[PDB]
Structure formats: C-alpha cells, structure tokens
C-alpha cells in the first residue's frame, strides 16, 4: 500500500475505545426548545449586529461590558470598583472572610494592649553625656588646629 | 496582499537590514539574516528596519543546507531593543529571534522554542497557535 493510500486509510479510519463505553453528555434541555435563527423571519431574535447597526455601526457603537454582569444586587452593575487606596491594592485585600480575621486582629490588639506591648518608658547620665560631647568637640578643635599648622 | 500587517501600533524598531537573528522554530535554520523589511518606506540613506510582529525577508546563514539558497518571509517574534507598549510598559527580550513563514503568514515549522511577543501573537494567528508561552 502506497504512502498516500495509507494516509487516506488513516483519514477514513475511526478509532473507538475497546471497552465500548461512552462518556456522559451535558447538553442543556433548552437546546431542544430553541427555535433556529432565520434572517428572513420577521420575528427573529434581535442580535448585537442589529443593535450596533441601529446605534452607529461598527467603530462608532460602544458596547456595554457590564450589561451582562450577574450580581447579588443589580444596582451595583455600573459602580466604579476601587483599585488603589493609599499606595495599596484593594484586590490584594479582597477576601470573603475579612470580618472574622479583622475581629481576631482586634482581639489580638486589645490583648497586647492589656499585656503591655505598646507601653513606652538619669540626670547623671545626661551630665556625663554632655561632658563626653564637650570633650569630643575639644578633640575636633585640636585636630583642626593640627590640620591648619 | 503584501506581508505588512494591519492594525500594528508604533513601536521602537530594533532590527535593521544586515541584522542576524536566531531562528525560533524547528524549520532547520539556526539564524536569519535580514535583507528587507515589508512595508518599509522610502527615505534617503535610511536603513529599513522592523520590530516584533513585522515581516522581513531573510536568508539563512547557518543551518540546514537546502534552506541556505532561498529568501524566506519571516516574522520577528523577539527583539532585544527595548520598546513601549500602550500600557506604559517598556520591555525587551534577551535575544532577537524570528520564525519562517509563507506570505500568507502560515509557519514553515511546527514548534516554537521560547516565548513570542504579544504583537507577533496578536497579528499572526498561526504563531499564537504554535506558541507555548506569550509574553
């Protein structure tokens, strides 16, 4: 059998699993109830091409990306979602379990405040430090005199 | 239709005529020597040049022998000269590299080694189909 003929044999060959089993399919039930779209049908479904043609054509019509959002409250569909706050990313801090962690943080904060973690604390020491600073100044003046001479 | 693609934004061209780039596919060639750039204008003393996503005409200086006698269309997928994208990001790759294609934009090879540019991937759908990583 020539190479071209084996190629068309491999094209017409249909491979099947040896066990004869089949996978479960997941076609939704609305597909059977769908009516096929026809251009000549006067009651056809209005499409995005139709809306774009009615609102300026291609390159003029501005599509609304938030129109098909699924939210808990549909009033939120056109909000300005925050992104930056005081040099920090809001999306870095977005967490569904935020209130429990924050309340645990508040418990920890009051625990360390009760334990004394943020608490804040001699004249002879100040005197000896002032004397040492005076001595260092005199040393610097002596070095400057040596550098001059 | 000439090989110059449409819908390309302005970027810094890093590869003039005479540049040797790496050959990033498995067509057998190892390097590509630029002799022309598609869509280049006319200006006195100016060398034609191309950036990432441009089609050039390239001869093979090193590689498989029967590729060494022809001039091939090629798409530049990586460049080392830094350029800016519209998001304000200046970026560059560590080498200059391209892939051999036909004038319709379909690739001669079957695999791409290394990343390709976003510009090349967005302008040539077969390079996006044969890219493993797009940067």
């Amino acid at each position: 059998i020539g190479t071209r003929l084996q190629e068309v044999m491999a094209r017409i060959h249909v491979a099947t699993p040896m066990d004869g089993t089949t996978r479960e399919t997941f076609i939704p039930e609305a597909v059977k109830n769908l009516k096929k779209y026809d251009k000549n049908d006067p009651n056809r479904r209005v499409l995005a091409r139709d809306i774009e043609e009615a609102n300026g054509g291609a390159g003029v019509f501005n599509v609304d990306l938030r129109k098909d959002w699924i939210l808990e409250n549909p009033e939120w569909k056109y909000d300005k979602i925050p992104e930056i706050f005081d040099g920090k990313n809001v999306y870095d801090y977005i967490d569904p379990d935020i209130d429990a962690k924050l309340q645990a943080l508040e418990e920890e904060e009051e625990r360390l405040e009760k334990e004394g973690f943020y608490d804040e604390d001699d004249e002879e020491e100040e005197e000896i430090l002032q004397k040492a600073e005076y001595i260092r100044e005199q040393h610097a003046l002596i070095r400057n005199e040596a550098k001059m001479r | 239709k000439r090989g110059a693609p449409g819908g390309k934004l302005k970027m810094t061209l890093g590869l003039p005529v005479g540049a040797i780039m790496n050959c990033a596919d498995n067509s057998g060639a190892r390097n590509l020597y630029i002799i022309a750039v598609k869509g280049a204008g006319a200006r006195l003393n100016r060398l034609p040049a191309g950036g990432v996503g441009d089609m050039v005409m390239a001869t093979v200086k090193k590689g498989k022998p029967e590729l060494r006698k022809k001039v091939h269309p090629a798409v530049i997928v990586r460049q080392a000269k830094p350029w800016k994208r519209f998001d304000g990001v200046f970026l560059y790759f560590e080498d200059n590299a391209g892939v051999i294609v036909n004038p319709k934009g379909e690739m001669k090879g079957s695999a791409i080694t290394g990343p390709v540019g976003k510009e090349a991937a967005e302008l040539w759908p077969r390079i996006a189909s044969n890219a493993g990583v797009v940067m």
């Binding site: 071209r4 003929l5 190629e7 068309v8 044999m9 491999a10 094209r11 017409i12 060959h13 249909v14 491979a15 099947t16 699993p17 040896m18 089993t21 089949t22 996978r23 479960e24 399919t25 997941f26 076609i27 939704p28 597909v31 769908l34 779209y37 479904r45 499409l47 995005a48 091409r49 809306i51 774009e52 291609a58 390159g59 019509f61 599509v63 990306l65 938030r66 098909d68 959002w69 699924i70 939210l71 979602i81 992104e83 | 994208r85 998001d87 379909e106 695999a111 976003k118 991937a121 967005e122 759908p125 077969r126 996006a128 189909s129 044969n130 890219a131 493993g132 990583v133 797009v134 940067m135």
Partner: protein
C-alpha cells in the same frame, strides 16, 4: 450544527473563541459579528462573555476550561479576572494559574471528563487542573506535537485530531479518552485543529474556508444535528473522503 464563521476575515476561530458546555468566551473586536454568530447559535442558553486576556485577543489560545471550571494565565489582570467572575455564574470555578507555559489553550485540551496536557507542565499545575476542572489529567503528545490544545479539538461526543496521526496512536488515545477520535483537517487542509475550530456537545464553529467533506467529518465525529454519528465516516462518507483527501 457546525457553523462556518470568521473573526475579522480570519478563519482561525479557535484562536479568538473558547467554547465549553456551560459558557462561551469571545474576543472583543471592532464589530459584533463574531459575537453575534455565537449569539445566534446560543440564544441565551449559556452566557457569552466578551473578554480580554493580558491585553490580547487570543483568548482561545490563552484560556482553557470546561463546564466546571476556567483557567486563565498569570498575566491576566485583576480587572479582566473580575469581569470574567462577574459574567460567569458561581457554578463555574475560575482560577488564575502560575504555569510557565501560559498559552493554556495551547497546552491544555479538555472535556468534562478528561484533560490532555503538554508534558512539561508543573505538578502543582496538574493538581490545579484536576481540582478546578474535576477531570483526569494525562500528559500526552498528539502526532509528535506537544501543543495538544491547538492540535486537537475535544468534546464529550468525540474528538478530531491532527491528520498525520498514526492509526495505533488514535486507538491508544481513544482508549485513554473514552471518546471516538477521527484524524481530519479544518480550514481547507490546515492541521491546527484547536486553533481552527471550537466545539461543545451540541455546537461546532469552524472557519469559513472549511470545506464540505471535512465539515461533514466534523459533523459526524461530534454528533451534531439529527442522525449524526462517527460510524457514518467509513460507510456513507467513505467515498467522499477518499475522493477529496487522496
């Protein structure tokens, strides 16, 4: 129900679209024609999301998923991820992954039961695939190509693979996947099946240059419309296929 379509005069539908059994993703363009093809075929049965991935329109070759999950690469932005999460219902799990081979539509091909991947994906990436998609994951090459998601189209009905696949390779792959597979081409002899077409359990969308014999092959192997089966290929369409592809 196999439909010829084009995204801005390009026949590579699978580059710009991603089709599963519960949603469709279409690239944002300068017109509504490519969106309206899918809108006409899917009349609000499953949601269609106009989406952008990493600032690019090659979402079909950058995203992978099935009816249970969706996987986007690491360069997907927070706003694109939020738009996808808001457009899709909570039944679908969306995850951004850190995989090195970020062309997920190239390196992953999957249906609702099993997923073939590029053999150099990371182990935790395989874990994320098997978790979010809920499928069995196999590392396999098809016709010596490591980009399974671009060189294979797969559904629960069946699969169409690279035309130069060996018969024993198709047998091993069909036994591994549990679905019938046929070697064929799209877009008048193109071997990039995943880049050329998208498919789910009841709809296929190919490019405009897909010829009538290979369109009938796609119809039979994916069981589209009334009286469609992969056994029609070697009995009823055998003479047509031998005449066309010899």
């Amino acid at each position: 129900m196999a439909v010829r379509a084009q995204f801005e005069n390009s026949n590579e539908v699978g580059v710009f679209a991603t089709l599963t059994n519960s949603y469709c993703l279409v690239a944002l363009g300068a017109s509504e024609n490519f969106y309206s093809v899918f809108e006409a075929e899917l009349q609000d049965v499953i949601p269609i999301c106009r989406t952008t991935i990493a600032g690019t329109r090659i979402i079909g070759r950058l995203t992978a998923g099935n009816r249970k999950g969706l996987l986007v690469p690491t360069t997907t932005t927070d706003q694109e991820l939020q738009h996808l999460r808001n457009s899709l219902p909570d039944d679908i799990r969306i995850q951004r992954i850190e995989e090195r081979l970020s062309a997920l539509g190239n390196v992953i091909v999957c249906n609702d039961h099993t997923a073939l991947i590029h053999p150099d994906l990371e182990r935790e990436t395989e874990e994320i695939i098997a978790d979010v998609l809920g499928v069995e994951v196999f590392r396999q090459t098809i016709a010596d190509h490591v980009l399974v998601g671009s060189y294979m189209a797969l559904s629960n009905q069946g699969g169409l693979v690279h035309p130069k696949t060996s018969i024993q390779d198709q047998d091993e792959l069909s036994s591994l996947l549990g679905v019938p597979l046929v070697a064929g081409s799209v877009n008048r002899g193109s071997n990039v099946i995943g880049g050329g077409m998208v498919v789910n359990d009841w709809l296929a969308v190919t490019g405009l240059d897909t010829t009538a014999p290979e369109l009938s092959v796609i119809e039979s192997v994916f069981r589209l419309g009334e009286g469609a089966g992969p056994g029609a290929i070697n009995t009823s369409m055998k003479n047509t296929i031998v005449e066309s592809f010899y």
